[PDB]
CSV table of C-alpha atoms and ligand atoms in Angstrom, one decimal:
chain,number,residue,atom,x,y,z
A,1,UNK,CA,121.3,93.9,202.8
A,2,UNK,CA,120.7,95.1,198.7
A,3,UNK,CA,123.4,98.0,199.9
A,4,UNK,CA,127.0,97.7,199.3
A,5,UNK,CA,129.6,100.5,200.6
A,6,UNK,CA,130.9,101.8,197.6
A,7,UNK,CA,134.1,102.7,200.0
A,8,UNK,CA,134.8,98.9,200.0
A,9,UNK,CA,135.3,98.8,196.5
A,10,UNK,CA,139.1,99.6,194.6
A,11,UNK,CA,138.5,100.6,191.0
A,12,UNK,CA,141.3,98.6,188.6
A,13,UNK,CA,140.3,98.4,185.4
A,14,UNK,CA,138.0,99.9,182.3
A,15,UNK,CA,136.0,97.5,181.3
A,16,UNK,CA,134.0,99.7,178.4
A,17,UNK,CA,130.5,100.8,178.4
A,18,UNK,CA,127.1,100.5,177.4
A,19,UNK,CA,123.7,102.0,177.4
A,20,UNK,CA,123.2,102.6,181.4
A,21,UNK,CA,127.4,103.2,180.9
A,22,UNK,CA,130.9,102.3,182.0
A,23,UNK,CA,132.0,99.2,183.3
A,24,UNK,CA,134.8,99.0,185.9
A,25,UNK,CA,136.9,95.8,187.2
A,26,UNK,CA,138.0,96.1,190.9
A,27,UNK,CA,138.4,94.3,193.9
A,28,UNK,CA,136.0,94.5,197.5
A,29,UNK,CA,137.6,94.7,200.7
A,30,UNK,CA,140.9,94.7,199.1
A,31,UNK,CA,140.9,90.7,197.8
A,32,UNK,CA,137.4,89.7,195.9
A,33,UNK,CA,137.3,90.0,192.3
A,34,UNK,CA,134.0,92.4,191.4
A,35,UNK,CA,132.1,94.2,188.2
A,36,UNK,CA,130.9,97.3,188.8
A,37,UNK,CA,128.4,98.8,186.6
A,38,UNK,CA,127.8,102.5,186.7
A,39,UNK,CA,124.2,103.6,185.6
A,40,UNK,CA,124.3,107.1,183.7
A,41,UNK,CA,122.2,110.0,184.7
A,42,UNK,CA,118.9,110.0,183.3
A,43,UNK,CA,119.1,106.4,181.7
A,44,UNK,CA,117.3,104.2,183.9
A,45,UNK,CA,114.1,104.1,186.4
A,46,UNK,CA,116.0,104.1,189.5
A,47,UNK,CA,113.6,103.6,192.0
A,48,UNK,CA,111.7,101.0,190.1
A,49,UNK,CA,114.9,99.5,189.6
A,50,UNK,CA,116.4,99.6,193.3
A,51,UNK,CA,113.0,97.6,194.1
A,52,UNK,CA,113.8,94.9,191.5
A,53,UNK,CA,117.2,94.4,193.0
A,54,UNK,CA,116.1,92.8,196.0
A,55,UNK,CA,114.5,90.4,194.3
A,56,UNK,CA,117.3,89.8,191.9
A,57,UNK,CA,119.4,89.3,194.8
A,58,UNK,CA,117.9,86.1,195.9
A,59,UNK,CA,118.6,84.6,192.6
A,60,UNK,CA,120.9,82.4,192.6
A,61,UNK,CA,122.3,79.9,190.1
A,62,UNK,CA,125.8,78.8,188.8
A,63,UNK,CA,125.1,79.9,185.3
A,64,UNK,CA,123.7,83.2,186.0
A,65,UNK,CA,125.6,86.3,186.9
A,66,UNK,CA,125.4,86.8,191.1
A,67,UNK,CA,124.0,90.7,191.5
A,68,UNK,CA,126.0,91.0,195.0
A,69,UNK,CA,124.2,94.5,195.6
A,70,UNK,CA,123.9,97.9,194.4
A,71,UNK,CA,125.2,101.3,195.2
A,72,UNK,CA,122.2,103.8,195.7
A,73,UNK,CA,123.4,106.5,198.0
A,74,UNK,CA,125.2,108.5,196.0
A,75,UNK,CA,124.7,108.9,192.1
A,76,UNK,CA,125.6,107.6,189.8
A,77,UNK,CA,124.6,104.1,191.3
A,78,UNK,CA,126.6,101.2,191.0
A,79,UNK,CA,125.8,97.8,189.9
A,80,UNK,CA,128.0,95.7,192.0
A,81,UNK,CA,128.2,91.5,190.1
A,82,UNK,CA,130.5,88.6,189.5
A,83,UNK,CA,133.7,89.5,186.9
A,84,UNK,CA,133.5,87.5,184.3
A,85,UNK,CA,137.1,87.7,182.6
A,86,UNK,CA,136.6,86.8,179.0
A,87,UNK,CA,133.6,89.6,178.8
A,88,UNK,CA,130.7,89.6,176.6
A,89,UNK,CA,129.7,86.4,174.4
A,90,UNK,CA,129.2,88.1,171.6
A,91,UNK,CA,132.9,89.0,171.2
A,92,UNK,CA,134.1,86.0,172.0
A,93,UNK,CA,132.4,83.9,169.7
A,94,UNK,CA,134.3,86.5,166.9
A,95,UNK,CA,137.0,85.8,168.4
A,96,UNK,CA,138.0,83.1,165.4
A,97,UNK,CA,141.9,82.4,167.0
A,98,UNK,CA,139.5,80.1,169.8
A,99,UNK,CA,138.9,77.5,166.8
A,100,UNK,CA,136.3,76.4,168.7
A,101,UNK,CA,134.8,72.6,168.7
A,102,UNK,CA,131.3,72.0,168.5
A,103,UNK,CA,130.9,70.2,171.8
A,104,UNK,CA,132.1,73.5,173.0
A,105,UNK,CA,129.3,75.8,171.0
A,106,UNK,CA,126.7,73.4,172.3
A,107,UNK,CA,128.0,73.2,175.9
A,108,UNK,CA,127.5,77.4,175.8
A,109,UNK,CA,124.0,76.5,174.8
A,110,UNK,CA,123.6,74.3,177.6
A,111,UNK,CA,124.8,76.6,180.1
A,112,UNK,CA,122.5,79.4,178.9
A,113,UNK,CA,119.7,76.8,178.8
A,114,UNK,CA,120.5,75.6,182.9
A,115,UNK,CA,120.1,79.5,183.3
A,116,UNK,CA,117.1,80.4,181.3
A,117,UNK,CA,115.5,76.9,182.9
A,118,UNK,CA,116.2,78.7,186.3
A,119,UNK,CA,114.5,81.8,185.4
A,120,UNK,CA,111.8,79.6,184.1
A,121,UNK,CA,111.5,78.1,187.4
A,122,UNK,CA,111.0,81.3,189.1
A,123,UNK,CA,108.5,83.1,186.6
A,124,UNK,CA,111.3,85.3,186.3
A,125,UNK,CA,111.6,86.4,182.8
A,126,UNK,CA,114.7,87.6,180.8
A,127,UNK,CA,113.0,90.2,178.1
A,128,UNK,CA,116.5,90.6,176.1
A,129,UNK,CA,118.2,87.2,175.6
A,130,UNK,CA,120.9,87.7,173.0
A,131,UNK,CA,125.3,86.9,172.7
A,132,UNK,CA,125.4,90.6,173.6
A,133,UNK,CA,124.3,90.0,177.0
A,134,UNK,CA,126.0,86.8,177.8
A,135,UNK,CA,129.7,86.6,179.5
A,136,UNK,CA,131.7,84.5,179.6
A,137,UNK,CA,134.4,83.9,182.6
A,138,UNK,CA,138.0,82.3,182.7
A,139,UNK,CA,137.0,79.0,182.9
A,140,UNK,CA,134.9,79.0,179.4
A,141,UNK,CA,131.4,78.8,181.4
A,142,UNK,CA,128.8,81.3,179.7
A,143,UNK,CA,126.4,82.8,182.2
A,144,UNK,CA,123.1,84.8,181.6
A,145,UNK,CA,123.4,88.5,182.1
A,146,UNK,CA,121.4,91.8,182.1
A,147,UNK,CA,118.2,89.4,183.1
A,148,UNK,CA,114.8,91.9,183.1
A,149,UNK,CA,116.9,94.9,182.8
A,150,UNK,CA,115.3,96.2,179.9
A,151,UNK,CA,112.1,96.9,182.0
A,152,UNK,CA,114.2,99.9,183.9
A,153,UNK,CA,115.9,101.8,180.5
A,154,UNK,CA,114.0,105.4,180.2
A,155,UNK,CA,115.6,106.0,176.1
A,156,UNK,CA,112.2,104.9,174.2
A,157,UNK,CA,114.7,104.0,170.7
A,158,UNK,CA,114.9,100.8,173.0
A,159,UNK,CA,111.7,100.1,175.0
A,160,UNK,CA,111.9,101.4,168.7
A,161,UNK,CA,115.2,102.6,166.4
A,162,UNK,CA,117.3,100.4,169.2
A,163,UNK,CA,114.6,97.5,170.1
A,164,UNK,CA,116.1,94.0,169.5
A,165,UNK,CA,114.1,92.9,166.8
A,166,UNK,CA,116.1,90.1,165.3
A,167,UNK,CA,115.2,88.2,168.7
A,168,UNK,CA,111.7,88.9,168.8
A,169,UNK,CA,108.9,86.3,167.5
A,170,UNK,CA,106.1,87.1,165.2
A,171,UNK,CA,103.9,88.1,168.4
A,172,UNK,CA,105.7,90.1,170.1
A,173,UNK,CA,106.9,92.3,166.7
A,174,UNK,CA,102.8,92.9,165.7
A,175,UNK,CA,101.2,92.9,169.9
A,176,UNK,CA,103.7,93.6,171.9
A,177,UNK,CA,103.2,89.8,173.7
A,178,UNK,CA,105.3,89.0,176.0
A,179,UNK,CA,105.6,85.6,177.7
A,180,UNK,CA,107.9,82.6,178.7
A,181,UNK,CA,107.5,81.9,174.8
A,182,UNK,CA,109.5,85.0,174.0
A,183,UNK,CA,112.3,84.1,175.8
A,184,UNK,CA,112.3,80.6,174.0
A,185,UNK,CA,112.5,82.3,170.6
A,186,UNK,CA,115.1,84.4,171.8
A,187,UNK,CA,116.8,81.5,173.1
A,188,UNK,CA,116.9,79.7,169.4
A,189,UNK,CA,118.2,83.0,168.1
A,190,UNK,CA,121.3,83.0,170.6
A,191,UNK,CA,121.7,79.3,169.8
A,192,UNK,CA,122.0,80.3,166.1
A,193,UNK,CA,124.8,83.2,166.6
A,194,UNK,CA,126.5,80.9,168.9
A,195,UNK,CA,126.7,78.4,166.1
A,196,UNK,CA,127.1,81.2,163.5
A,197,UNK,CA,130.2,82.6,165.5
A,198,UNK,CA,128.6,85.7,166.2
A,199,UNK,CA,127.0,86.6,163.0
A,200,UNK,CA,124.1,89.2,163.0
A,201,UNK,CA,120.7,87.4,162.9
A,202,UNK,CA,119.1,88.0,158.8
A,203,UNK,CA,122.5,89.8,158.6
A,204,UNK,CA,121.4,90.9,155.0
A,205,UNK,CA,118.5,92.6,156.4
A,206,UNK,CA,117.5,96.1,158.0
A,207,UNK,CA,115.4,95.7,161.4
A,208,UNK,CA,112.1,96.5,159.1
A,209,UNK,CA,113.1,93.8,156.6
A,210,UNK,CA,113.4,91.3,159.7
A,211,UNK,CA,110.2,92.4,161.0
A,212,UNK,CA,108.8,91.5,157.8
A,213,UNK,CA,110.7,88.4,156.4
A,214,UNK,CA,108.7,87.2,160.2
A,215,UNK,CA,105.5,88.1,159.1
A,216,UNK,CA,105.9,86.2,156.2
A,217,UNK,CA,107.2,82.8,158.0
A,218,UNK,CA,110.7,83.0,156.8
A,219,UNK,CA,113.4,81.9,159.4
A,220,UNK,CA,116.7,82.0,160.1
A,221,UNK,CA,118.3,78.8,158.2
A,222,UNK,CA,121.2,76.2,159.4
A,223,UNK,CA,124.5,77.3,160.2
A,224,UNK,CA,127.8,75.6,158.8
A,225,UNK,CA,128.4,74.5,162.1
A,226,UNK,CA,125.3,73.0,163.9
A,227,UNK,CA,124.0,69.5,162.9
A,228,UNK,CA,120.7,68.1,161.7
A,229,UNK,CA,119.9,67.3,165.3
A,230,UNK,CA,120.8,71.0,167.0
A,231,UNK,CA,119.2,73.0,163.9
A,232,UNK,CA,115.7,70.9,164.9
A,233,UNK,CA,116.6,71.8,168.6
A,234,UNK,CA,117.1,76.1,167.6
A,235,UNK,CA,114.2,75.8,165.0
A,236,UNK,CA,112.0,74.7,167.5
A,237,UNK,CA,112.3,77.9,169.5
A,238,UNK,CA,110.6,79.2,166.4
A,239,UNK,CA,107.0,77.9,165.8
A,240,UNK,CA,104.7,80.9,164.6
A,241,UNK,CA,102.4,79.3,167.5
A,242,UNK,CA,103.9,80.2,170.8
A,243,UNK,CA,101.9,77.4,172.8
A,244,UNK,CA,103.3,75.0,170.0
A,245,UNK,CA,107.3,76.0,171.3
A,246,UNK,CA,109.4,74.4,174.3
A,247,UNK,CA,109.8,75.0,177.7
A,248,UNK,CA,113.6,75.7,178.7
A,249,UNK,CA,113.0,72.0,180.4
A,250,UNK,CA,112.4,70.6,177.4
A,251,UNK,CA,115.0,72.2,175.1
A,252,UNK,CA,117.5,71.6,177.9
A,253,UNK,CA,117.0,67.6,177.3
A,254,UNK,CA,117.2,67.7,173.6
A,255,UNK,CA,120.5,69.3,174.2
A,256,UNK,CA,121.5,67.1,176.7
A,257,UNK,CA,120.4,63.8,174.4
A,258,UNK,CA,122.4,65.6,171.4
A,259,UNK,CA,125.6,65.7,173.4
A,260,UNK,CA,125.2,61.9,174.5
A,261,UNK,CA,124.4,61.2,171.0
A,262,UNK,CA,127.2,63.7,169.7
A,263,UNK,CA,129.9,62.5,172.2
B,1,8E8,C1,131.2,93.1,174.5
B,1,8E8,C2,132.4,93.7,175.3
B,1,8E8,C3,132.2,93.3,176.8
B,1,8E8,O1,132.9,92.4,177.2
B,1,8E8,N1,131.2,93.8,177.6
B,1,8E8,C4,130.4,95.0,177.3
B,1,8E8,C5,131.1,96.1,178.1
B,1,8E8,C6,131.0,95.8,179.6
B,1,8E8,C7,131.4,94.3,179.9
B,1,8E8,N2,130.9,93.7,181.2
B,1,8E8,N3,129.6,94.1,181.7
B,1,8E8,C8,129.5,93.4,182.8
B,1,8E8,C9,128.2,93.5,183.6
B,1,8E8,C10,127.0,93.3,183.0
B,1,8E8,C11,125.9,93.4,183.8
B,1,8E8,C12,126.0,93.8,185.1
B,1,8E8,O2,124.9,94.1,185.9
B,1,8E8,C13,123.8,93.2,185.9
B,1,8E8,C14,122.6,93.7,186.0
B,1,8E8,C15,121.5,92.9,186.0
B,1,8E8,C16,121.7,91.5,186.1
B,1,8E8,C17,123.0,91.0,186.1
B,1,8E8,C18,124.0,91.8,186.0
B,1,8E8,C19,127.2,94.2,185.7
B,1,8E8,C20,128.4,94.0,184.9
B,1,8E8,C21,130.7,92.6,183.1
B,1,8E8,C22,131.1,91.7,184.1
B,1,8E8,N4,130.4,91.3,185.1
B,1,8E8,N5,132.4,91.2,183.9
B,1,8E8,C23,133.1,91.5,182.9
B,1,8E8,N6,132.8,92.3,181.9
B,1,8E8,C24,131.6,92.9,182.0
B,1,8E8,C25,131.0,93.3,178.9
């Protein structure tokens, strides 16, 4: 049921590629709209991985990428999801013809937030959260991608010369901790390059600086574009205490109050 017949599929379009490797647009059974990701040899734990998909199969939410199976009979192996048209967020926020309003940047927030809340719900967590792994399809609606992914990529430089350390808090940067509360800072990170139009987090600063500027207690600050009200809601996602930080419940109010109050 996790098995699709890569002879369904009709290859149209190069999407580009990543770590695990080349993205293709195509169509199943000759009409449906598909992604297919193909996982490089050597790049990922692929029986770890196949094991995972089953579970990430029954996930299901409008703001989260559908996984509608995988490929495994034949290698490489395909990841087989939803197209999402307008590709990855981090693009199109740099994308400064869009002109975009606020009320759009926060909605994007809100629709990562439904996701992440989701996840939340299902003890399910992320591990990556950043614009880079967020698309985005025709209709405007950003959906969470690449969810727990990281736990399958065998290149160490990620798992670090290549681990994302702008998104990381203080805890998981000196212990290697984990949680639901890593997720959240993450979560205020991607609300501040949202609002930043894609700017790199502590843009200024090497990986090593950022590590550091953390361990101090310095923060990312406001971006021209976010108000008083959705600063507090990003900074939030920040407190050195991880117990002392939001659930995506929570933060998915705030936001919600800050559009009423912003509409
Ligand atoms: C930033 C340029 C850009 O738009 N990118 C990066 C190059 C590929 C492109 N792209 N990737 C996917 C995609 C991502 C993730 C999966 O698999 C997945 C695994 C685990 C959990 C969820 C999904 C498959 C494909 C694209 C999709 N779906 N549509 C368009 N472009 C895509 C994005």
């Amino acid at each position: 049921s996790w098995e699709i017949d890569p002879k369904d599929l009709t290859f149209l379009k190069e999407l580009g590629t990543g770590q695990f490797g080349v993205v293709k647009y195509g169509k199943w059974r000759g009409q449906y709209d598909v992604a297919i990701k193909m996982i490089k040899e050597g790049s990922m734990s692929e029986d770890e991985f196949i094991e995972e998909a089953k579970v990430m199969m029954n996930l299901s939410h409008e703001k989260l990428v559908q996984l509608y199976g995988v490929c495994t009979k034949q290698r490489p192996i395909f990841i087989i999801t939803e197209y999402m048209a307008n590709g990855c967020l981090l693009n199109y926020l740099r994308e400064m013809r869009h002109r975009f309003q606020t009320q759009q940047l926060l909605e994007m927030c809100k629709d990562v937030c439904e996701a992440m809340e989701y996840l939340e719900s299902k003890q399910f967590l992320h591990r990556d959260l950043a614009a880079r792994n967020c698309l985005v399809n025709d209709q405007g609606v950003v959906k969470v991608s690449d969810f727990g992914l990281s736990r399958y990529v065998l290149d160490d430089e990620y798992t670090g010369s290549k681990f994302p350390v702008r998104w990381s808090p203080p805890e998981v940067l000196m212990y290697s901790k984990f949680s639901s509360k890593s997720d959240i800072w993450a979560f205020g990170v991607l609300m501040w390059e949202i609002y930043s139009l894609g700017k790199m987090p502590y843009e200024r600063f090497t990986n090593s600086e950022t590590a550091e500027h953390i361990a101090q207690g310095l923060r990312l600050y406001r971006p021209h574009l976010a108000s008083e009200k959705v600063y507090t809601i990003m900074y939030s996602c920040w407190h050195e205490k991880a117990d002392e930080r939001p659930t995506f419940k929570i933060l998915l109010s705030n936001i919600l109050d800050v559009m009423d109050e912003e509409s």
